[PDB]
Amino acid sequence: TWLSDFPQAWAETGGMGLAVRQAPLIIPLKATSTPVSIKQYPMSQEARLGIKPHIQRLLDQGILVPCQSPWNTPLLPVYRPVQDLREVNKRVEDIHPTVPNPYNLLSGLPPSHQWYTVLDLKDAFFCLRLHPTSQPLFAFEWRDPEMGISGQLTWTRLPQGFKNSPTLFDEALHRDLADFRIQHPDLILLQYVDDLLLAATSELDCQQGTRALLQTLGNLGYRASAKKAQICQKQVKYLGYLLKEGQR
DNA sequence: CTTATT
DNA sequence: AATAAG
Numbered sequence: 001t002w003l004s005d006f007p008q009a010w011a012e013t014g015g016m017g018l019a020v021r022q023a024p025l026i027i028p029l030k031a032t033s034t035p036v037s038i039k040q041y042p043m044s045q046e047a048r049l050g051i052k053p054h055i056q057r058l059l060d061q062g063i064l065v066p067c068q069s070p071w072n073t074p075l076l077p078v079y080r081p082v083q084d085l086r087e088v089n090k091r092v093e094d095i096h097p098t099v100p101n102p103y104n105l106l107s108g109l110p111p112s113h114q115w116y117t118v119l120d121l122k123d124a125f126f127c128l129r130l131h132p133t134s135q136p137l138f139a140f141e142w143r144d145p146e147m148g149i150s151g152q153l154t155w156t157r158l159p160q161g162f163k164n165s166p167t168l169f170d171e172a173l174h175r176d177l178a179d180f181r182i183q184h185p186d187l188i189l190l191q192y193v194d195d196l197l198l199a200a201t202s203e204l205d206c207q208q209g210t211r212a213l214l215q216t217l218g219n220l221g222y223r224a225s226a227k228k229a230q231i232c233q234k235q236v237k238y239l240g241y242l243l244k245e246g247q248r
Numbered sequence: 249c250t251t252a253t254t
Numbered sequence: 255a256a257t258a259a260g
Contacts, residue, residue, distance in 0.1 A: 041249050076249055076260080084250070084260045161260050 003226055006211070009218030010226040011122035016061050017223040022172050024129040025158060027137060033091035035070035038084075040141040043077060048145075050079025055142060055153070063126055067154045069139035082161065083140055089163040092137075099170045102239040105190050111246040113188050113199035115206035117213070118230040118238050121173075122223050124194035125158040125165045128172055138162070166193045176220045184209060190238075196224075197238045206232045 007013040043051075058064040076082050121127070130138075139154040158165050170193050181189060187209045188199040198213055200206040210231055217224060230236040235244045242248055 043249095073260090074249070078260095082260065086251075086260055089260085163260095 002210075002214075002229070002231055006214040006218060009214040009222075009224055011223040012226045014218060014223050016063075017121075017123065017127035018129070018221045019127045019172060019176065020221045021176055022128055024131040025134065025168060026131045027134040027162075027164070028093040029091055029137075030093050035136075036087045036091065037070060037072040038074055038087060040072070040074050040143075041076075043075070047077030047079055048143075051075070051077055051081045052144070054079075054081055059153070063155065063157050064153045065135075065156055067136060067139055067152050069136035069152055069154060071137050071139050072152060073138070073140055075140045075142070083138070083159065085138070085159070085161040085163075088137055092162075092164065095164055095167055097167055099167055099193060102192060102241070105192055106239070106241065106248075108190065109188060109197070109199060109243075109246075113201055114234060114246055115200050115203050115232060116230070116234070116236040116238070116243055117198040117206060117210040117232055118236045119196045119198075119213070119217075119224040120228055121194040121196070121217075122225050124169055124173075124222070125160060127222055128158040128169060130156055130158060169193055173222070176222075177216070180213065180216050184212060189213075192239055195239060197236070197243075203232055 003010060003013065055064065071088065073088055074084050076084060135154050135156060138159050139152045142153045143150040158168060170191060173191060177189065177191070186201065186205070190197040198206070198209050200209050214224070
């Protein structure tokens with residue numbers, strides 16, 4: 001089965017990802033920026049209990065670590081933790097937006113290739129390390145009242161809510177899949193941040209391409225959702241479109 | 249929570 | 255003078 005033949009490539013069986021070929025990212029600040037420390041709005045127990053197991057899992061995974069930082073932004077309950085990084089985003093230097101819009105990305109899909117595989121990468125941003133010099137930027141407060149703990153945590157990986165994460169991830173994955181594209185000149189590969197479409201001429205070519213892509217992704221440290229994977233179908237859902245008969 | 253948008 | 259999103 002696809003599941004058993006490529007255990008390293010699936011989030012379900014391969015463990016948390018880590019993009020091993022990618023240098024830890026340094027996040028340049030705007031030229032006049034200085035740290036901003038926003039106090040954490042008091043959180044109810046209901047929200048804190050809701051968020052706690054998520055925080056513990058991230059600590060166990062090393063994705064969060066304790067820190068002391070002049071930066072601080074508030075964590076909100078939505079329960080899963082959502083950090084309001086807007087004041088950090090304002091202070092970070094802008095980068096060019098290189099992720100194509102889906103309409104333009106799909107223009108690169110030729111009628112000749114109608115056998116599709118769609119993969120989405122799980123916890124994509126978390127596969128990219130953040131350089132220790134940039135980790136303090138993303139700090140937030142975590143208190144555990146009945147565990148006698150109050151201090152800051154921060155991210156050791158590219159965080160959700162950071163304005164440049166989608167663009168930085170898309171650029172990193174492009175670097176990592178550059179060779180794959182060269183090795184498979186007759187496959188079409190569309191990348192939209194963590195959403196991938198592989199297109200080929202025949203069911204067989206799509207099977208061989210998909211095997212090659214899973215092997216490569218797993219090797220590089222990325223993880224795809226086996227649950228959501230659409231493999232070698234003549235009809236797939238990609239970026240909200242229904243891809244069918246070369247239409248849409 | 250704060251905050252940019254008839 | 256409700257809404258979506260971080």
